[model samples]
Target: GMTEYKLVVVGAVGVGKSALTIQLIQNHFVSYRKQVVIDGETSLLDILDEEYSAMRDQYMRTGEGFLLVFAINNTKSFECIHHYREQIKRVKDSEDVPMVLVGNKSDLPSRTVDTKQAQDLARSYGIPFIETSAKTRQGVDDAFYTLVREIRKHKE
Candidate 1:
């Protein structure tokens, strides 16, 4: 039997959370279902790519992993990452959760948040950091794949 991974992509509006997720599953946008092989294990990925709607807590409670996304070109979006992280931890009631820090829109020419800052934040949280451009598909697969690996590791 294949394992099912519940993954949620969270970020401020216009940060391209949906863009990254769509690129991963459809190479295109949507809350998607796809088969992915990570570290030789085939699994089903149930991705949630919704805004901060009323079911945000429900998603956090049930999600096995999360992609905390921010736009590299938007400083405000980057600033909101902390709130999403904190909310996830609060809902999960765990300091350690399977999470990936995603700096999206990496293809943009005007980047406000430096890579070093994002890297430092991820290091402090003990999570993996990746830069991705949904438009170009750079680092898209790696971001979701790394989160699957993180969830697997957390289970062990």
Candidate 2:
């Protein structure tokens, strides 16, 4: 059976938010007119823009799944990850919400944050960590798929 779900994507600026969404643009059907996926199950992935500082509470409060992404080449982006994670926790008021910590820009050289560091961060939070490159389409689908599957398991 197929069902619709909402997934939120968040990250520091220049972390390939739009690029990653474009990578997930397998359909153009619905849901805030954001990125659409038509795999076995249909889902909408919306980018939660941090620029709208005023809407943080309402915006981060609701989501079936969340993608915490950061550019692998940017150490600053990785550092800001904790802020995003904590914000979601505060807004959702639940620590068990389905989420994934993603490292984007994996294909780029001059990587700043090593894979182990990212893995350690995810491990501490007890969530999955995936490295994705929006430019090469690497791990993008897997990241989303993993989160969606987590959401399903969570709902069960």
Candidate 2 lDDT = 0.79
Please, what is the whole-model Cα lDDT of each candidate in the order they appear? 0.88, 0.79
Off by over 4 Å in 2: 26-55
Could you report the Cα RMSD, in angstroms, for every candidate shown?
Answer: 2.2, 4.0
Per-residue C-alpha lDDT of model 1 across residues 1-156, encoded as one tens digit per residue: 999999998888878877786788778744589998888899999996533332368767889999998899988888888899999999999999999999998888999999999999999999999999999999999999999999999999
| 36-126 per-residue lDDT for model 2 (tens digits) | 4545556655544342222266867767788998999888889888888888888888888889999998988989999999999999998
Best by TM-score: 1
lDDT score, candidate 1: 0.88
User: Which one wins on lDDT?
Assistant: 1
Model 2: residue 25 alpha-carbon error in angstroms: 0.6
